[PDB]
Amino acid sequence: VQLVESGPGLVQPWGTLSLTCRVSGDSVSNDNYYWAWIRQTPGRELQVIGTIYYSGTTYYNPSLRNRVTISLDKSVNVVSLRLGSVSAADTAQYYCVRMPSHGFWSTSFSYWYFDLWGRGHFVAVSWASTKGPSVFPLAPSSKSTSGGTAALGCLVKDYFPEPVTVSWNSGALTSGVHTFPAVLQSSGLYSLSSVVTVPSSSLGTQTYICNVDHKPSNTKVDKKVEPKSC
Amino acid sequence: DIQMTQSPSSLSASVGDKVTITCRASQSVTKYLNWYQFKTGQAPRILIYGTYTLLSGVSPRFSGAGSGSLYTLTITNIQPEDFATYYCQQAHSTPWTFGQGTHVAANRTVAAPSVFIFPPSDEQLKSGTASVVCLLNNFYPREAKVQWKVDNALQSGNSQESVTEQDSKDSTYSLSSTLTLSKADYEKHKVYACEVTHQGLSSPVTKSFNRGG
């Protein structure tokens, strides 16, 4: 059983924001399960947006009830969330979730818990328009060497909205990598850096490429990082 | 709505210690109380439902307890894979509500950071600004002081800092202090230096370059 959530990265204020969760294990009309949407705001608070059943019945959190609708699309096995009149306070990670429906004679009747969670999907809500990042090398030098190992990276500067995804050597490099969290610059745009430590002997034989992705502006960038000879 | 509070908000522990997390509710929730595990990298994961019940594949180190308004999660022989943040949720009333979360991090032995410095990329100087990065790699504890000095003067609001989460195996942090400047100011000065103070360093450690040569 797999749960893949999807939707837009950025939504305009007063718009309606739609997410879809594709359910990959069993049918949504399984009727042993309800399906639900739960969200986490920046600031770590968990809010439970909605409850639904194969029969069509829905539960909505009162603070949203005036403007949310959840529904099943049985033919393709998806569960949909629409959220209208959306504001900045709807910026959050949106999780799709499964919930056992225990029947009357079940040992565990009336026990309601969220037993399976998707990975989440982030939605920023902003008047501001999309903007891709610029990528600059952080080249290794003698100034970025300590003993036998050298440090190198690339700077991902001036982008909106969050998030950016960074990899090294197309995924083949995953040892000692540190891609930091973003920071909100004075401009109102975000920037981060991604850095890896490698053995200094390996410069001049091993190529180091960093791969940046920014899906809200359809940006993919591969920046090659060359050694300096300080 | 039933209000929920966990204690402590954050704690840190050595591998092997017993760790207990308390969850108090504004009403009685009569044992309809669930526990979840949140780690960066994976999807949130349930471990207990209805105060005491473990789900398949959750290790028996985890154990739940409680009644009335007061419940408690316990990690018995805490392991590297257990360091994460834990949430309690009440299933008693119509609008279901979670706690605020307890972040459990590792205690570890002191580790001094290795310091690196990066001047601005030629590509970036063409664009008209200049960012210089100071990197502090793989240290513990989290507290570290990073001061920037340009031709011996301290920089005020010139720089921004960022800090990774604790490494899963290393149990350590890394930190970037990036100082951002107009191409103007950067062309002005000569000697750019990054000074670091941290426990497990006896003397402050400085890394510096001269603009150009």
Partner: peptide, 19 residues
């Protein structure tokens, strides 16, 4: 809504199990 009802139903079911 049905959720809150199961809260009471549990006790109904106990009343039943006794008999």
């Amino acid at each position: 809504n049905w959720f809150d009802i199961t809260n009471w139903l549990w006790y109904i079911k106990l009343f039943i199990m006794i008999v």
